[PDB]
Coordinates of C-alpha atoms and ligand atoms in Angstrom, one line a residue:
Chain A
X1 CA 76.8 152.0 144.1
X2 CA 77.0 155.8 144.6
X3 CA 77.2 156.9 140.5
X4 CA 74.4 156.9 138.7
X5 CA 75.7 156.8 135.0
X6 CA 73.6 158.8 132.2
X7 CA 71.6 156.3 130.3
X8 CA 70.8 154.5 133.4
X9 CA 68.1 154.2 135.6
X10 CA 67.0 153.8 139.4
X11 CA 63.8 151.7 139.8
X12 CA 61.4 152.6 142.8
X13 CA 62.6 150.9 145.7
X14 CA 66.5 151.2 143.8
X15 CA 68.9 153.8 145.1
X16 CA 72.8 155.1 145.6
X17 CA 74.6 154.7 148.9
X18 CA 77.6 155.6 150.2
X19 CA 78.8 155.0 154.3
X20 CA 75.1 156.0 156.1
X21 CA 73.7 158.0 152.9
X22 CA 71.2 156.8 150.7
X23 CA 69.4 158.5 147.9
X24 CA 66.5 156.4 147.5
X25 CA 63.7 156.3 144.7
X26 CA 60.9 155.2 146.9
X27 CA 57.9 153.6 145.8
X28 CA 55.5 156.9 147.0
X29 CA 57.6 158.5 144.3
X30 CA 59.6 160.8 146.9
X31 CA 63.0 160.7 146.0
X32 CA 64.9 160.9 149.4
X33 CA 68.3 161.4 150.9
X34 CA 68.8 160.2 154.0
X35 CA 71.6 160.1 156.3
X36 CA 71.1 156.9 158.3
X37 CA 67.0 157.1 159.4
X38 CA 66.8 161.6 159.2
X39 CA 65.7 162.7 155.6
X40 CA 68.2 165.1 154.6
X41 CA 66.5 166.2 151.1
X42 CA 63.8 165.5 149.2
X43 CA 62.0 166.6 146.1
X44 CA 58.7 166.2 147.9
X45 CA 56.8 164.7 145.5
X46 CA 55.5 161.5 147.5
X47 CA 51.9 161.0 147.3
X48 CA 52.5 162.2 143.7
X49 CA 51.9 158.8 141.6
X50 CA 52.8 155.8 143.2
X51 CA 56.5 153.2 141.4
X52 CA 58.4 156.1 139.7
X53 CA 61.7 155.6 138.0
X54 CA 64.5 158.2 138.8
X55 CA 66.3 158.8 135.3
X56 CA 70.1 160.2 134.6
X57 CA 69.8 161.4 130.7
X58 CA 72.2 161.7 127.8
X59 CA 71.4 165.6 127.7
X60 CA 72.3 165.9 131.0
X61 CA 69.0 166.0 133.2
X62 CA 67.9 164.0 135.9
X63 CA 64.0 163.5 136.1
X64 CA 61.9 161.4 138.1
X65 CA 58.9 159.8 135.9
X66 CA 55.6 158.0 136.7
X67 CA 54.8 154.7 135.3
X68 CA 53.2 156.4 131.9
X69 CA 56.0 158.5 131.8
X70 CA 55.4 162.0 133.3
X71 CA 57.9 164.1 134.5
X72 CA 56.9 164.4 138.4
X73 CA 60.0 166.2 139.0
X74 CA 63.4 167.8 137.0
X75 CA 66.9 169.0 138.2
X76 CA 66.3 171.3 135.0
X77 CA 69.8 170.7 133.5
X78 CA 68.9 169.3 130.3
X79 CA 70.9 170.3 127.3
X80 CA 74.2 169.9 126.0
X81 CA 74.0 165.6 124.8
X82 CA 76.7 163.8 126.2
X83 CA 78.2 161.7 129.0
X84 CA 76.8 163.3 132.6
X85 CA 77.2 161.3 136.1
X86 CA 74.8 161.8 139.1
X87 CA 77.2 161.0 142.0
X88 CA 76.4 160.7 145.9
X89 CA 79.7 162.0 147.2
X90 CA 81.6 161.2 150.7
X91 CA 81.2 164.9 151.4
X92 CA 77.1 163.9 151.6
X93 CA 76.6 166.1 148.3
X94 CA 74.4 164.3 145.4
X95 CA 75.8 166.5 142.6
X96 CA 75.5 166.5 139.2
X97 CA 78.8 166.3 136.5
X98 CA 79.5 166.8 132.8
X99 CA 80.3 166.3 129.9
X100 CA 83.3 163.6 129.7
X101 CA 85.9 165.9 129.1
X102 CA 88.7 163.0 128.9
X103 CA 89.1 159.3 128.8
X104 CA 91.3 156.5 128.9
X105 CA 88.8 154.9 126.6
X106 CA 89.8 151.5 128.1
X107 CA 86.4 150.6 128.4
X108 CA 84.7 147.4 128.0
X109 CA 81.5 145.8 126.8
Chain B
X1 CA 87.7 154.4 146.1
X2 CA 86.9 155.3 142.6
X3 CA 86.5 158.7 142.2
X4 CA 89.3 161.5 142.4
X5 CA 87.5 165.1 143.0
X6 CA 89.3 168.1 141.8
X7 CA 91.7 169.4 144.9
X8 CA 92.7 165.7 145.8
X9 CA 95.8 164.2 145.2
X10 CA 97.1 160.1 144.7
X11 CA 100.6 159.7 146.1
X12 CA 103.1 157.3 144.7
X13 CA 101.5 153.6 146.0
X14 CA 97.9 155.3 146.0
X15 CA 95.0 154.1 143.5
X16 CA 91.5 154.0 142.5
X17 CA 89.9 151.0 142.5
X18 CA 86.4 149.0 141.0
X19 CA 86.7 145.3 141.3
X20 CA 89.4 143.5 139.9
X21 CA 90.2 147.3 138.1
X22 CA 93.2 149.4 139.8
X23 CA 94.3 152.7 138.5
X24 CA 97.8 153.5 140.2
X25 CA 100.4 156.4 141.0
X26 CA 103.2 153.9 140.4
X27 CA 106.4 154.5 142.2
X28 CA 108.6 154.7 139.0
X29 CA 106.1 157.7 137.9
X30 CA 104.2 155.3 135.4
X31 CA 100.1 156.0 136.4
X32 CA 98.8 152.6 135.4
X33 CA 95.3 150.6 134.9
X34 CA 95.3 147.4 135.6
X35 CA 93.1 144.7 135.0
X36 CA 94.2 141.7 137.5
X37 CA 97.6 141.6 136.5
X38 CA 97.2 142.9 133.3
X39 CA 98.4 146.3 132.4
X40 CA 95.7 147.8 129.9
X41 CA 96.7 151.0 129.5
X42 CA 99.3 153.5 131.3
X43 CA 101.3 157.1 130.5
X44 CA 104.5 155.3 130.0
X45 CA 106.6 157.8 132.3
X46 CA 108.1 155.0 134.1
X47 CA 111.7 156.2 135.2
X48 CA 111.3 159.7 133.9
X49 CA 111.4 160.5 137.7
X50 CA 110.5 159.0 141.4
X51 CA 108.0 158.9 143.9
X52 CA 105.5 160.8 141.8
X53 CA 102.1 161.9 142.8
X54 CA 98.4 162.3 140.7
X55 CA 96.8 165.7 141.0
X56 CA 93.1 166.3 139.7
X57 CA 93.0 169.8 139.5
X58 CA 90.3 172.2 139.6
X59 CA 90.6 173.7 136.2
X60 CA 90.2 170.5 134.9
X61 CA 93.5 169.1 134.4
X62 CA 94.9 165.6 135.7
X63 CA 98.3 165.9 135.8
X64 CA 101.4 163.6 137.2
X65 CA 103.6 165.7 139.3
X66 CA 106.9 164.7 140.9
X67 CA 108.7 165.9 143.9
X68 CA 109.6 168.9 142.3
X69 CA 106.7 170.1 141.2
X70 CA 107.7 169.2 137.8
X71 CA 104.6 168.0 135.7
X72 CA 105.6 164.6 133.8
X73 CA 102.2 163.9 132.2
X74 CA 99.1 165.7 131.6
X75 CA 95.5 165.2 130.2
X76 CA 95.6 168.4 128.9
X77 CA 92.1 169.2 129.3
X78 CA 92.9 172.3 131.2
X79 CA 90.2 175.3 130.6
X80 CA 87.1 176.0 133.0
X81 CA 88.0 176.5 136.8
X82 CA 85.7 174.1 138.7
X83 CA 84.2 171.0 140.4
X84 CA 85.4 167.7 138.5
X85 CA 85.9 164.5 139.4
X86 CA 88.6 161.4 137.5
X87 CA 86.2 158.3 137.7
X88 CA 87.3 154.4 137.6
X89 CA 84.0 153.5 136.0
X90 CA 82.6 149.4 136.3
X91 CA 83.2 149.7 132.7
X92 CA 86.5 149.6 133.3
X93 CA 87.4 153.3 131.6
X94 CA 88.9 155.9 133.4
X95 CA 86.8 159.3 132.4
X96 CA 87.1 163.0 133.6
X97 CA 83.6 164.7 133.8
X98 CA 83.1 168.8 134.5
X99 CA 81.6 170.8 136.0
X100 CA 79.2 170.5 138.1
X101 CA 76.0 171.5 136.6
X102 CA 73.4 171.1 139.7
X103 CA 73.4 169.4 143.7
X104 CA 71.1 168.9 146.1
X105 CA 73.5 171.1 148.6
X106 CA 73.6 168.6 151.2
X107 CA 76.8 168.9 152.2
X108 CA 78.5 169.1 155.4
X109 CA 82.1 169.9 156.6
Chain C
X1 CA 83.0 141.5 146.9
X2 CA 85.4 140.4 149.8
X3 CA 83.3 138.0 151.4
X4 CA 82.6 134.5 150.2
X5 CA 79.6 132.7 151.7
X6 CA 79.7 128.8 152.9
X7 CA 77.2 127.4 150.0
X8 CA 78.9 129.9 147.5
X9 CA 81.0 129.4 144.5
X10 CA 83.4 131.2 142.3
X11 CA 83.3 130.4 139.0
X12 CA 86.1 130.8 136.5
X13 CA 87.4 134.3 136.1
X14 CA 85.9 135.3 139.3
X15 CA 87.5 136.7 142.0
X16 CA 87.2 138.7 145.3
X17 CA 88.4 141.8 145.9
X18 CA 90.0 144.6 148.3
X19 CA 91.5 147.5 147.6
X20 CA 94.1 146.7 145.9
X21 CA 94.4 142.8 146.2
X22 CA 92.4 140.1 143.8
X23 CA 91.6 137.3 145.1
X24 CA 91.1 135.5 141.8
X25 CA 89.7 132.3 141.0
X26 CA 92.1 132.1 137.3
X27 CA 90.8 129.6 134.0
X28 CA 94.2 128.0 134.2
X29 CA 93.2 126.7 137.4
X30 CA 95.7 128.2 139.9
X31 CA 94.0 130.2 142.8
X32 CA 95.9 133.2 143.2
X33 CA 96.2 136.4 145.5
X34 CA 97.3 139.4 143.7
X35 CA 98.2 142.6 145.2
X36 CA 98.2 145.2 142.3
X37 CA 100.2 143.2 139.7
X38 CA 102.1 141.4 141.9
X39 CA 101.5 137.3 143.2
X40 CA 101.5 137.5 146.8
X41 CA 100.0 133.8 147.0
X42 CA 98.7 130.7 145.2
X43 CA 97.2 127.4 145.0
X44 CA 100.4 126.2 142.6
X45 CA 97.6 124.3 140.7
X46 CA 98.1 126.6 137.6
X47 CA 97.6 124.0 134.3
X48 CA 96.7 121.1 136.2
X49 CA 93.0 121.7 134.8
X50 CA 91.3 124.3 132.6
X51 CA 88.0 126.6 133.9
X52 CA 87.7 125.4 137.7
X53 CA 85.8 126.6 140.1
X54 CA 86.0 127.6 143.6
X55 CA 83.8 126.4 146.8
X56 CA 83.3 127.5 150.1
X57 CA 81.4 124.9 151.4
X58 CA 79.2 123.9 154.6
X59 CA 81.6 121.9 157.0
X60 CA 84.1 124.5 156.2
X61 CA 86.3 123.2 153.5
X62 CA 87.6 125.5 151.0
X63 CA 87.7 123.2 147.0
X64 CA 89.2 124.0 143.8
X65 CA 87.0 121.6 141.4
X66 CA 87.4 121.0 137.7
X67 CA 85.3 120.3 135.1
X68 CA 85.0 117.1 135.8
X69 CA 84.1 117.5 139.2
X70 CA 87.6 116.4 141.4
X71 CA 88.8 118.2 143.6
X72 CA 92.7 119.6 142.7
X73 CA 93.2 121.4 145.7
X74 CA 91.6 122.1 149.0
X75 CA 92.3 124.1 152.1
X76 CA 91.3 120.7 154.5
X77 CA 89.8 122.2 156.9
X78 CA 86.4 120.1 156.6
X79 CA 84.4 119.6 160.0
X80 CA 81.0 120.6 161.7
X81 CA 78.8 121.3 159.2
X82 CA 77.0 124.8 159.7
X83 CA 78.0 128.5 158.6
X84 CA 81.6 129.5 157.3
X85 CA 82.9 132.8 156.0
X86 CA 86.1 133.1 153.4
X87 CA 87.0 136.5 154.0
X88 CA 89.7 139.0 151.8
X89 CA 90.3 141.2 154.6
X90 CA 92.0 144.6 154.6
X91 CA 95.1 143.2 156.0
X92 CA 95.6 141.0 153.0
X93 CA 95.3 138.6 155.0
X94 CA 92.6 135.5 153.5
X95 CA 91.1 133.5 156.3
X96 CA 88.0 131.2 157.0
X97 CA 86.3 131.8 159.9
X98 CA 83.6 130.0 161.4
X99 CA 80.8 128.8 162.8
X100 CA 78.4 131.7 163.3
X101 CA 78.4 132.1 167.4
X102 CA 75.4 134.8 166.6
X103 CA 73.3 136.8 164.7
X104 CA 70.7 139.2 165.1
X105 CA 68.8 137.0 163.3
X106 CA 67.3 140.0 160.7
X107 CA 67.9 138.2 158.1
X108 CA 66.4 138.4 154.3
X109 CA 66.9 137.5 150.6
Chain D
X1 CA 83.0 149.1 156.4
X2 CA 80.9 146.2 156.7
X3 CA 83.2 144.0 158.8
X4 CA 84.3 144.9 162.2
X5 CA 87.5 142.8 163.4
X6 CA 87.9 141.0 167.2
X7 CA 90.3 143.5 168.9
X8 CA 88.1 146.7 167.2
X9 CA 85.9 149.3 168.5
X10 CA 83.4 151.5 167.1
X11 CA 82.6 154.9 168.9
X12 CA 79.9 156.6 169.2
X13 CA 78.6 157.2 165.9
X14 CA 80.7 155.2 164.2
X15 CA 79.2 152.1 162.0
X16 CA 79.2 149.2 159.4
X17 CA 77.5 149.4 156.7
X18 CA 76.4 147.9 153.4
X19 CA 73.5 149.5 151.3
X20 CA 70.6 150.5 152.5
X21 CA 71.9 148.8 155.8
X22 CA 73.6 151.0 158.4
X23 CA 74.5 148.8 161.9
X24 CA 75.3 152.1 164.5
X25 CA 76.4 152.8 167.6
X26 CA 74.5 156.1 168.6
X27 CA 75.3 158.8 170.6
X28 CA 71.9 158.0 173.1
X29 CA 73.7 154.3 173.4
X30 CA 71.1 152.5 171.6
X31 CA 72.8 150.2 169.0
X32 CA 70.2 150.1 166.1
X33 CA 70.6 148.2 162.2
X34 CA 68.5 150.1 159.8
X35 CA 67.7 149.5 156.5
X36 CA 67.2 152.0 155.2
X37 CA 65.0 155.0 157.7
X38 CA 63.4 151.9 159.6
X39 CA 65.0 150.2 162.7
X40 CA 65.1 146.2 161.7
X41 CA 66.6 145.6 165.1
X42 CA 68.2 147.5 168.2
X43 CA 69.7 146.4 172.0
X44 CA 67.0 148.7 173.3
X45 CA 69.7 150.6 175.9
X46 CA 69.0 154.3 174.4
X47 CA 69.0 156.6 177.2
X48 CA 71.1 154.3 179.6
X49 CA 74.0 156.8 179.2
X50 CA 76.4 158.8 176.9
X51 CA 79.2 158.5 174.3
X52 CA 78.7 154.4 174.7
X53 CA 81.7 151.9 172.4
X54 CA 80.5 149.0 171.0
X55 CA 83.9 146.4 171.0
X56 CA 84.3 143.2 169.0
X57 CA 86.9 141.2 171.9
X58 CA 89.3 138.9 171.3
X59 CA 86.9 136.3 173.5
X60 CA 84.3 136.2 170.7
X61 CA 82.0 139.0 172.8
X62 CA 80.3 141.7 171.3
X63 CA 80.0 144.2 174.0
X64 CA 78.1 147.3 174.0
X65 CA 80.6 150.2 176.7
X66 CA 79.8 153.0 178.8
X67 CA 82.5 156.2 178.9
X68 CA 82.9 154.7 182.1
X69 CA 84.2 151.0 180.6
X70 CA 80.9 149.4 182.5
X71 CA 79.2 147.0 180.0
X72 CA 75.7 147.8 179.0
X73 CA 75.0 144.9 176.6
X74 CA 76.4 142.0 175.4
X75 CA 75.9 138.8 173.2
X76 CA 77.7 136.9 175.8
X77 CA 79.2 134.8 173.8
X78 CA 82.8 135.3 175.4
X79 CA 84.5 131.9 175.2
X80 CA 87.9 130.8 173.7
X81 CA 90.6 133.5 173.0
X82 CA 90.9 134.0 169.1
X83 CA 90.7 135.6 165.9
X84 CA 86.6 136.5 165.1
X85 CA 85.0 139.4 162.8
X86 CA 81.4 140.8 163.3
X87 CA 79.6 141.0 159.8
X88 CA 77.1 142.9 158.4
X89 CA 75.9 140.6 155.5
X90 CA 74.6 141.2 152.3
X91 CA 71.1 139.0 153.5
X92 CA 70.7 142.1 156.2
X93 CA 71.8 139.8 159.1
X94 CA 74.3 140.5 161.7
X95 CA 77.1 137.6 162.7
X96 CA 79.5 137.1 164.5
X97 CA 81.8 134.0 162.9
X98 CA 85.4 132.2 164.5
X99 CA 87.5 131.3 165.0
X100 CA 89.8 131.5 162.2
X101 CA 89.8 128.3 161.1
X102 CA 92.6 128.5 157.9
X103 CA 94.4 131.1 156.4
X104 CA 97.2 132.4 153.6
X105 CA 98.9 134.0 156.3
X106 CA 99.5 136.9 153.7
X107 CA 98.9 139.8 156.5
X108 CA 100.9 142.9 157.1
X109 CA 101.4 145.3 159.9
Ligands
LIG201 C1 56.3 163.6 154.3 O1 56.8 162.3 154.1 C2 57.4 162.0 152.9 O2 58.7 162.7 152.8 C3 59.6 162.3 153.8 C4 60.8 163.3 153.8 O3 61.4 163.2 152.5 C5 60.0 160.8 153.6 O4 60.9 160.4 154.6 C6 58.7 160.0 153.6 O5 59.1 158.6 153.3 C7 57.7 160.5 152.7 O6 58.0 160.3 151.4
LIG202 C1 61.8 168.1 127.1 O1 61.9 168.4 128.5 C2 63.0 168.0 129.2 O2 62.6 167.7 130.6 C3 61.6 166.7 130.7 C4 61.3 166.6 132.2 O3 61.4 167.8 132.8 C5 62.1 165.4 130.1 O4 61.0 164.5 130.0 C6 62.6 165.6 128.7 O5 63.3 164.4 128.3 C7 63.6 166.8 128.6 O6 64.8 166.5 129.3
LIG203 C1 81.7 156.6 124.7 O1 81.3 156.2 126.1 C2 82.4 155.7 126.9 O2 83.4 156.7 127.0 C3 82.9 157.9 127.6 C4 84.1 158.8 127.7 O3 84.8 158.9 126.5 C5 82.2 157.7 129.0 O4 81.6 158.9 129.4 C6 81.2 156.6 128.9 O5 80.8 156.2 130.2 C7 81.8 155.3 128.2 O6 82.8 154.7 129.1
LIG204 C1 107.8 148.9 131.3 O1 107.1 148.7 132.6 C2 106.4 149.9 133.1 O2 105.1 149.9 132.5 C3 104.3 148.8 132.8 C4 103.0 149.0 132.0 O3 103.2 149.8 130.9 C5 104.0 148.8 134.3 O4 103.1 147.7 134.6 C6 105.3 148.7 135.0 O5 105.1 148.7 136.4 C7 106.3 149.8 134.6 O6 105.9 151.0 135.1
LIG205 C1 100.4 174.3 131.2 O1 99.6 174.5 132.4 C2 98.7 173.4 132.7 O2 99.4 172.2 132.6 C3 100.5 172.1 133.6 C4 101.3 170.9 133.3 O3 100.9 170.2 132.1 C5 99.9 172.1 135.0 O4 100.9 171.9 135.9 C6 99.2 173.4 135.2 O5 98.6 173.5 136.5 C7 98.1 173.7 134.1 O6 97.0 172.8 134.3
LIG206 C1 80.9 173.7 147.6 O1 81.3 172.5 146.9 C2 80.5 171.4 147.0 O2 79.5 171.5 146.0 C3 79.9 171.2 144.7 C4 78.6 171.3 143.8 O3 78.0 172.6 144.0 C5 80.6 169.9 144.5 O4 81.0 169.7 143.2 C6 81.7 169.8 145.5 O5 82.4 168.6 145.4 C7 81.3 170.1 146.9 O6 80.4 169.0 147.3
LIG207 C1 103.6 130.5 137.0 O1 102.3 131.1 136.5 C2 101.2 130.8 137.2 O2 101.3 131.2 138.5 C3 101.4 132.7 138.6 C4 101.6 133.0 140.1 O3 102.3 132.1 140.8 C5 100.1 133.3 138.1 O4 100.3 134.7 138.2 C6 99.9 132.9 136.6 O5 98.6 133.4 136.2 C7 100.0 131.4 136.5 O6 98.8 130.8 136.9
LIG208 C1 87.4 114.3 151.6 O1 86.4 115.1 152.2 C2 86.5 116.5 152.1 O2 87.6 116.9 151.2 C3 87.4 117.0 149.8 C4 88.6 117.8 149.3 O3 89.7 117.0 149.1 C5 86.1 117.6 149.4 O4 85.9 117.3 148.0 C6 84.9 116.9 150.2 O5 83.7 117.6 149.8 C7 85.2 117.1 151.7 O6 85.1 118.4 152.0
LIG209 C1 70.4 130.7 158.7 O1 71.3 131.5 158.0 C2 71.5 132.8 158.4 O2 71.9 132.9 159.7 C3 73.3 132.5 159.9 C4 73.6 132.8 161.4 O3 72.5 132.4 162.2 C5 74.3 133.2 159.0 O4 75.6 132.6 159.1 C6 73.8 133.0 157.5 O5 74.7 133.8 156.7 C7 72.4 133.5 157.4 O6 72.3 134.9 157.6
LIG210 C1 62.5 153.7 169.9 O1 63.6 154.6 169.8 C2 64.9 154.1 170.0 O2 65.0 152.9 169.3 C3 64.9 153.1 167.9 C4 65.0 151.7 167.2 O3 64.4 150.7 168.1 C5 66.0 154.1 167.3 O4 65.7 154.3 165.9 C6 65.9 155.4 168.1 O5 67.0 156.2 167.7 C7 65.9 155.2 169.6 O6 67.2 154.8 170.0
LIG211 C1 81.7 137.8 181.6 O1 82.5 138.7 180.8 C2 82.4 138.8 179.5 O2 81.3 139.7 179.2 C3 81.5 141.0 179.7 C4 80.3 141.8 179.4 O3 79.1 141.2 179.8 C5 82.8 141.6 179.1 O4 83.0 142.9 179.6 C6 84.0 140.7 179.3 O5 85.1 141.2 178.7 C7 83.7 139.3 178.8 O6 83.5 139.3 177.4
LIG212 C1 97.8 137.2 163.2 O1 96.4 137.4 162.8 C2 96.2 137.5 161.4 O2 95.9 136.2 160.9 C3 94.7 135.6 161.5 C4 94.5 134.2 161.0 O3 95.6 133.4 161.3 C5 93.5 136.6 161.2 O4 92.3 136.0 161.8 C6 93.8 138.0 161.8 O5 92.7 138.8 161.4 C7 95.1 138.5 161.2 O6 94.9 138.6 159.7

């Protein structure tokens, strides 16, 4: 998938695609974006801590944590608590939306 | 696809799409979700015009348009001028989320 | 998915899917093709059985089963046993193709 | 897409693709399946030219061109005159399956 929805998760080795991009949480905790085999962007944190966990939360952030659960690395958007999406767009952009600001509210569970 | 960024338009016949989920700009004007076969939810605008098209807007707005130019239906969640995006979730609601509050500025034209 | 593997099943209630067309294998038993709303195709088998199942087996043989394990409908196109492929394709077009003439051989699981 | 069709080409940087899998033709004529940044597999002709096609015939052969229309590579698995698709599988294997052996005959165009 290329949304990561907030609430959810990407475990290391777990990532978004879309066409040749991937946005991958690797397991050397360097959280890559690649387009095909050239890296793109990165937050260069590999070498950092080794199975991190990229996170999309409910107050809008998007950190990447270490097994005990330390921050190795923050978009800094934190706040406002809500709905947010992390989305890997066609355009290659990994961008960052929210809140909800309307809904069919046809959702299931 | 599943995702309708602000500045992109749905003509009449067009749709999202997630599975067995299809949000359509109907040709009667009626935008509908379907699941399978099954209408779940729609703007009942059916034969209030033809060949209509879906606009997400950049101030936010998702509005059904008609050849005219005539707006037939509207979210009415018009305000800040910016990057959005109408998303077909997995969970089978259609939600609006806005701004964009960060990106890795990856991308390319 | 629009693919459906030789030694794969659908169960009831599960489909495959493109764009806008289902491919859905229905609890009442009929296998239909829908495009949007509309039935483009079907098995006819609709309320012959209740929660069948579809499978794309090995000698190439495409069988609606039901509960109690007979087949109620099948494409009868059973031969040399090896690897088969049920495709939706973008066309709308369903088709069985088969056997594999090659394969980079890269696979994994 | 992650299905290329007998009777379809894919230029120069064109590809199939399905998550962390990207099958390319590249612009140095070397045609490469990653997964992810590491080459699982390649026909080993970068370098032999420019601009190179890779086409999916009619005769079930998956042939790697030069601008020129000389061949560079091939399964050469030409044989009977049909209907076959080239797949990039979900198991990270590349295939080439026909010919069509049923179908709903639901196609348009
Ligand atoms: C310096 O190497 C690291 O960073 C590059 C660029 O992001 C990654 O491709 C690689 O896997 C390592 O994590
Ligand atoms: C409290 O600080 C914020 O940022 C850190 C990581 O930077 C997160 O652990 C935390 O949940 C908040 O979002
Ligand atoms: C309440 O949660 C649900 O609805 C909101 C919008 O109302 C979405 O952001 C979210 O993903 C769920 O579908
Ligand atoms: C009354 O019918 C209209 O509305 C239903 C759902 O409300 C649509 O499925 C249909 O195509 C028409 O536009
Ligand atoms: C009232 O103005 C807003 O709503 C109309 C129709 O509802 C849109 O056409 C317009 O662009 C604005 O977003
Ligand atoms: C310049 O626009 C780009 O960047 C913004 C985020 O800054 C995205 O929302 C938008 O879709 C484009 O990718
Ligand atoms: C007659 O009804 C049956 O067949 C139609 C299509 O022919 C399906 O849409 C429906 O679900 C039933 O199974
Ligand atoms: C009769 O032999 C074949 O046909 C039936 C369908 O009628 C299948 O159940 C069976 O496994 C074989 O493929
Ligand atoms: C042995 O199975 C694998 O290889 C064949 C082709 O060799 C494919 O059809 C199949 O899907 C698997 O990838
Ligand atoms: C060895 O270099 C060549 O082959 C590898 C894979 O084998 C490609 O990644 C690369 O682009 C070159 O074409
Ligand atoms: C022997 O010919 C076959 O193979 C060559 C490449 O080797 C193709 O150009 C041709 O169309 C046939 O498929
Ligand atoms: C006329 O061709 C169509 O039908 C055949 C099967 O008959 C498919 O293989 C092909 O891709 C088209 O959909």
């Amino acid at each position: 998938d290329n949304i990561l929805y907030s609430g959810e998760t990407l475990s290391t080795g777990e990532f978004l695609n879309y066409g040749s991009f991937v946005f991958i949480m690797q397991e050397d905790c360097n959280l890559v974006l690649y387009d095909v085999d050239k890296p793109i962007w990165a937050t260069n944190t590999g070498g950092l801590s080794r199975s991190c966990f990229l996170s999309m939360q409910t107050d809008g952030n998007l950190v990447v944590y270490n097994p005990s659960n330390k921050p190795i690395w923050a978009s800094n958007t934190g706040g406002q608590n809500g709905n947010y999406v992390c989305i890997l767009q066609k355009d290659r952009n990994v961008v960052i939306y929210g809140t909800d600001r309307w809904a069919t509210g046809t959702h299931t569970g």
